[PDB]
Amino acid sequence: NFDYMFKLLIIGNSSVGKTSFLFRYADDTFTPAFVSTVGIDFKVKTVYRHEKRVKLQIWDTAGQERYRTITTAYYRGAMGFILMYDITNEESFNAVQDWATQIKTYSWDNAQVILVGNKCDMEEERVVPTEKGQLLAEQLGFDFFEASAKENISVRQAFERLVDAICDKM
Amino acid sequence: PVVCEVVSEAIVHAAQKLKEYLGFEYPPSKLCPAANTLNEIFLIHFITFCQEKGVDEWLTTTKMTKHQAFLFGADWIWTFWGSDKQIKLQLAVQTLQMSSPESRVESSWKKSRFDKLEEFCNLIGEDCLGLFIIFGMPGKPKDIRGVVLDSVKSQMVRSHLPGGKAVAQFVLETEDCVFIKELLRNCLSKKDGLREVGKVYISIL
Ligand SMILES: Nc1nc2c(ncn2[C@@H]2O[C@H](COP(=O)(O)OP(=O)(O)NP(=O)(O)O)[C@@H](O)[C@H]2O)c(=O)[nH]1
Ligand SMILES: [Mg+2]
């Protein structure tokens, strides 16, 4: 059907949970088996937003540096970005300003960006307070969520907020 | 220990195991088996051989998904890791049958598998090589042989063919060959010695 077809990219460092995030949103499941994405992949999900069907093609990128070129070759045509870090990994959070610069350099399209701190179920191993993440989100102009691909917390809410921002820019 | 000799052994063993299924045709039904079936048989035998020799720590086989095989023009990736746990080589392998599908994207992907493989290897970097593996030829349908992408490109600067026809042209005219052990002998120390292989094909048997 699809009057609307939106291109979304999930980007961020390796091991923050990007593939797990996409699989939880698309198939409602989680496996602990870490396999690192080689290059880029995508999935298509259709949603009933406020009135009518919207088809999202969501591109999971690879976080490793050697694929940084090829993933940036797929930033064109993007209307939305999930910039994702890990709340148990400070190196992932220190990189998000570089990732936001990468979005502004290689993509812009005036595309909406949302900042997600994944693995919020791992509170015993938390290293980044939520206040730091929401302060940097206020600074960069992005919406902020703390999510868990493992426990399905704030996962579909983040995609819904990104799609709502994309629709509100029309 | 030695990664290169085991990967060449595994390629030879997988080709010998795949030889049984090449050239099968049943005229009262579907003639040919699917390309994905031959790819999966080759990969299963290769991966089991590599697991038996304990080389999984320095060798990673990634079978591309249907989307990834469409986008990259490659059927699988072989990643060669070093002692320092960094990636030293990546072979992007596309398979062809010479005896004789986007499905989700919204087209701009009009390119052939050759051009997509070349663009993939350009984007990854200089340590990512492209490799065509041919299962069967016109005449002798059970022959398996490899061709490096750069040798094809060196022939396209002369012949002016599109790369898909240029590979098929290269395979049926080249008499000179290099064994897979000799090709993979370098494999870690120098990168360009893989791509300066020249006007030869790769012999697997
Ligand atoms: N506890 C917990 N673990 C998670 C969560 N999301 C992912 N993980 C774990 O973190 C690891 C990495 O997940 P993965 O999705 O592969 O991350 P990635 O960003 O796709 N890695 P890459 O960019 O290299 O492809 C896996 O072991 C996975 O089980 C989460 O919400 N909670
Ligand atoms: Mg991944």
Author numbering:
A (entry chain B): 18 to 187
B (entry chain A): 18 to 117, 131 to 136, 138 to 236
Passage from the reporting paper:
One such Rab15 effector is Rep15, which is known to have a role in receptor recycling from the endocytic recycling compartment but otherwise remains poorly characterized. Biochemical validation of the interactions is presented and crystal structures of the Rep15:Rab3B and Rep15:Rab3C complexes provide additional mechanistic insight. We find that Rep15 adopts a globular structure that is distinct from other reported Rab15, Rab3 and Rab34 effectors. Detailed biochemical studies reveal that Rep15 is selective for Rab15, Rab3 paralogs and Rab34 and does not bind to other evolutionarily similar Rab GTPases.
